[PDB]
Amino acid sequence: GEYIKLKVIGQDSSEIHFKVKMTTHLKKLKESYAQRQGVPMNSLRFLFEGQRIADNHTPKELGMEEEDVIEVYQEQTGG
């Protein structure tokens, strides 16, 4: 086990998929996605099973598997 594909679901139901190592910090995925949407990374919250993905979280830590989904929500007002 090395790489898995994660599906990132955009706010408009578009998707971008990322191949990541099980030990890669998910900051890299968050930054890439935000860059590709042209929005500041801190305007977004990235959720796995409804829980907030921190910059330092890894797929291994969060228990992610092949084709698991990450949802992108706008940050909450004041968050």
């Binding site: 790489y3 594909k5 990322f18 191949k19 190592k21 890669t24 995925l29 890439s32």
Partner: peptide, 11 residues
């Protein structure tokens, strides 16, 4: 309509 998008992230 959108094409498939797969990005490999460096470690």
């Amino acid at each position: 309509e959108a094409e498939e998008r797969i990005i490999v992230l460096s470690d």
